[PDB]
Design a protein around this nucleic acid. Structure first.
Length: 534
RNA sequence: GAAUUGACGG
């Protein structure tokens, strides 16, 4: 890295800043500058300063020069990818490649570039799989081979509200032979190396990504998963099942088996259910790591026999799970009960009994789940009633949202409890970003109209303030849609009083328009006639 | 629109 090389890439960088360069000329300069890297790919790409310029060049050049850079750097690509700066250079090369996925003329030239990369990785993959930087490069490479260009937290694999909502029940072809080739290369180690891969954070993350990209590819999943579990008809031998069970409380492995259970084909799921989990459900549910594996197991159960086993092992202990901070386990059991149509009423009753012991407690099932952590962390639970001002409990509210997807037959204690909360509590619930989802699930449930109406009426006087927030505005429209003319008019006039402020809100203009607040203000008789025709 | 209780970068 002589100073002339340094001056060159710095001068290229300033030239792009000064935005005096046409986008077509910019693209050609990017290509010329890449040629200045030939023979020095590793040195340029891993330089703490020049790597950032090399990212700019890769993202601004044309396909041919990108491919030329990838081909000339392939023999050092694992070294670039495991470097703390070079790994961003490597990822820029992939994002750049990915911008051409929609161009059918580019198919074979992209595939050749991926082959250069996969070939040198497959030759020696295990340290790159476990390297904190190279693991990000492998995840992106796997996505590209699948034809996925657009980043997804799920695939990489972060937690997200789409995934939580999915767990609770609320396309380019790619380069399939390159995906198979690379992922087979990552998995052709000894069973004893694989044991360590199960438990290394960074390699577990790579395998999580690969499993998600193979979703619904049963023939590949049935080859891949047994290698990862060290099983290679699919059968888990008794000693291997013990080893999988023993590793289940590990933070890295627990994340991996979460994904395995999500993508597992039916026959493979059933074998895992029976041989690994079947008599350990509660012990695994109380572990800080394993309980998320149990949530994934619960969510993907196939049939009523499995539902019964999970019921027998876990419902008697619902109170333990809530006390110990494992509400996600209960949420999942409740959610899959409504999905498999099994043990619905047994699940709902076990939840009531877990929160409300004596008969007098049961009218408080709703407040206690809205503030699940305050009630269970309470000093004196026989006097606890509310958490004034507190933020409501995400998972307690998600449980309730599942509860209100049951038929009214199974959830009468929940409907009676919610609809009988006093106005101040119902109002605080609607103003909470989680509690508003509870209200909305109840308005969408098949509870009686009279009962919905009772709750909505206790919101009178607060629709204006409710509407001034993004979450409340949805609740206001859900209440409105559920109302007769008398209450639609009540809500409409409350929004009128706050119409100035409401219009300065993100959602306000839409809400004002959907409810037709201007018509109501200016020609109320015609607004009432159009609403009545609904 | 609130998004679990246990991980990730120059």
């Amino acid at each position: 890295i002589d100073p002339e090389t340094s001056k060159y890439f710095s001068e290229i960088a300033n030239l792009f800043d000064s935005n005096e360069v046409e986008l077509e000329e910019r693209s050609v300069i990017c290509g010329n500058a890449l040629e200045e890297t030939r023979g020095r790919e590793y040195e340029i790409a891993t330089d703490y300063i020049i790597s950032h310029v090399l990212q700019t060049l890769l993202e601004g050049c044309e396909l041919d020069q990108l491919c030329s850079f990838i081909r000339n750097s392939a023999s050092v690509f694992p070294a670039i990818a495991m470097d703390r700066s070079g790994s961003h250079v490597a990822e820029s090369a992939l994002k750049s490649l990915a911008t051409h996925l929609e161009n059918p003329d580019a198919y074979s030239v992209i595939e050749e570039a991926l082959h250069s990369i996969c070939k040198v990785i497959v030759d020696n993959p295990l340290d790159m799989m476990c390297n904190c930087y190279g693991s990000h490069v492998l995840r992106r490479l796997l996505c590209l081979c699948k034809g996925v260009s657009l980043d997804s937290p799920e695939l990489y694999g972060a937690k997200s509200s789409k995934a939580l909502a999915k767990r609770l029940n609320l396309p380019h072809q790619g380069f399939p032979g390159m995906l198979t080739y690379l992922l087979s290369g990552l998995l052709s180690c000894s069973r004893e190396d694989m044991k360590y891969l199960q438990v290394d954070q960074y390699s577990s993350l790579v395998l999580q990504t690969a499993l998600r990209l193979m979703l619904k590819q049963d023939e590949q999943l049935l080859e891949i998963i047994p290698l990862i579990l060290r099983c290679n008809g699919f059968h888990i031998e008794t000693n291997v099942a013990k080893e999988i069970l023993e590793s289940m409380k590990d933070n890295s492995f627990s994340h991996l088996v979460e994904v395995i259970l999500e993508v597992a084909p039916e026959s493979l799921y059933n074998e895992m259910f029976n041989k690994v989990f079947k008599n350990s459900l509660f012990e695994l549910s109380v572990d800080r790591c394993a309980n998320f594996v149990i949530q994934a197991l619960i969510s993907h159960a196939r049939d009523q026999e499995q539902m019964g086993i999970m019921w027998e092992e876990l419902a008697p202990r619902f109170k333990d799970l809530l006390e110990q901070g494992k509400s996600g386990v209960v949420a999942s059991l409740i959610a899959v009960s409504q999905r498999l149509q099994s043990h619905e009423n047994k699940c709902c009753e076990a939840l009531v009994g877990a929160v409300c012991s004596t008969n007098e407690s049961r009218i408080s099932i709703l407040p206690r789940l809205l503030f699940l952590d305050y009630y269970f962390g309470c000093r004196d639970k026989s006097t606890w009633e509310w958490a004034p001002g507190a933020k409501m409990h995400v998972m307690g509210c998600l449980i309730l949202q599942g509860i209100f997807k049951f038929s009214s037959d199974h959830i009468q204690p929940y409907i009676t409890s919610l609809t009988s909360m006093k106005a101040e509590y119902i109002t605080e619930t609607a103003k909470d970003s989680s509690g508003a989802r509870v209200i909305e699930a109840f308005l969408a449930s098949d509870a009686a109209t009279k009962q919905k109406r009772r709750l909505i009426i206790k919101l009178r006087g607060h629709f204006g303030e409710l509407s001034l927030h993004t979450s409340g505005s949805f609740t206001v429209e859900k209440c409105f849609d559920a109302c007769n003319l008398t209450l639609r008019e009540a809500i409409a006039s409350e929004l009128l009083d706050v119409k100035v402020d409401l219009s300065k809100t993100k959602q306000g203009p839409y809400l004002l328009r959907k409810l037709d607040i201007d018509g109501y203000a200016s020609r109320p008789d015609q607004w009432k006639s159009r609403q009545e025709a609904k």
